[PDB]
Amino acid sequence: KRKQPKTFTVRIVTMDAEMEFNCEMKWKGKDLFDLVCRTLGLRETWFFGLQYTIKDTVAWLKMDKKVLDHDVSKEEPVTFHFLAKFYPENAEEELVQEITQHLFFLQVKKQILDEKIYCPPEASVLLASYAVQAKYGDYDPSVHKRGFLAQEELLPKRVINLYQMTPEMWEERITAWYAEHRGRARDEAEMEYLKIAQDLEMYGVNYFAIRNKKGTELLLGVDALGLHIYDPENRLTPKISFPWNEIRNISYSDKEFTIKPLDKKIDVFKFNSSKLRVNKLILQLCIENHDLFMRRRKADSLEVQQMKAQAREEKARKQMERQRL
C-alpha cells in the first residue's frame, strides 16, 4: 500500500539543457507541464508543449490526460521534449520574457540549421552573424582570431554545399557581419535573429501530406494565420490560404476534413489524410491556432480602446488645467 512509489522519473529536454523530475503517478499533462514552466521561470506558457514520439510521428502531451495514460515509451526515464508548439504572429511584440525569446531562438535556429525551414544563402550568413553575437558577445579581434568558429555549426549543410568555400572563408564572411553587431546584448542578438527568421516563408508552418477529393497529392499548412494548401513541389508559397477569420468552420468525418469558407460564394475545400494520429494533431493545431489568433485580435482591439481612452482622459485633463489659468 505505502511501499509502491508515488512517483516516477521523467526526463525533460529543452533546447538549453535536460533535467529530471519526480512525476506523480496520478499527474495529468498539465501538472507536469506547469512544473516544467515553473522551474524554467516561464510564464508565456501557451506557446509551449511537451512532445514525445508515437511510432514515427510527433505527439504532444495532452493537458487533461494522465501522463501514464499516453502512448509514451515507459523505459526509465520517460522523456519529453519541451518545445514551442505555436509561434507568435510578431515575435518582438509577443515574446516578452528573455527565457521565451531564448527558447524560440534556439528551436527556430535548429530548424534553420536542420533545413526544416528553407533559408537562402545571404540570409543564412546574416542569421549566423547574430547567433555568433548572441553566444560570443561583442567581436574582439585579439580574442576572436582566425579559426574561432571552426568547431561551430553555423550554416545549413545545403548552403555550405552550394559554394565549396572553405570553413575559414565562411568564417570570414560571418565575422565581417558579426563586427557590425558590436554593442548588442545576447537577448537583442537573439531577437534580431527571430525578426529575420520569422519572415522566412516556411517559418511556423506545420505541414501535413494530404490529398484532395480527386486523389491529387497536396500539403496542408497549419499556422498562426490560417490554413494553407501547397503544391507538394513548393513548400515556400501556398497556392490557396484560408485566414482564421475567414473560415466558418472546420469539420472532420471518416479521414476527410472540410474547410467551410466564411464567404458562402467560395465552395467548401475537402481533403483526405490517412493516419488518425495525424488527423488528431491537425485538429489540435487548428483549434489551438484559431483560438490564439482570436485572442490576438481581442488583445489588439482592447489595446486600441485603452489608448483612445487614455488619450481622451489625458487631453481632457490637460484642457481642464489650462482653463484654470
Author numbering: 15 to 339
What's written in the study?
Neurofibromin 2 belongs to the FERM (band 4.1, ezrin, radixin, moesin) gene family characterized by an N-terminal FERM domain that binds to the plasma membrane, a central α-helical domain, and a C-terminal tail domain that binds to the cortical actin cytoskeleton. Neurofibromin 2 is a unique tumor suppressor protein that inhibits cell growth both from plasma membrane and in the nucleus upon cell confluency. The neurofibromin 2 head–tail interaction is critical for controlling the tumor-suppressive function of neurofibromin 215,16, which seems also to be regulated by phosphorylation.
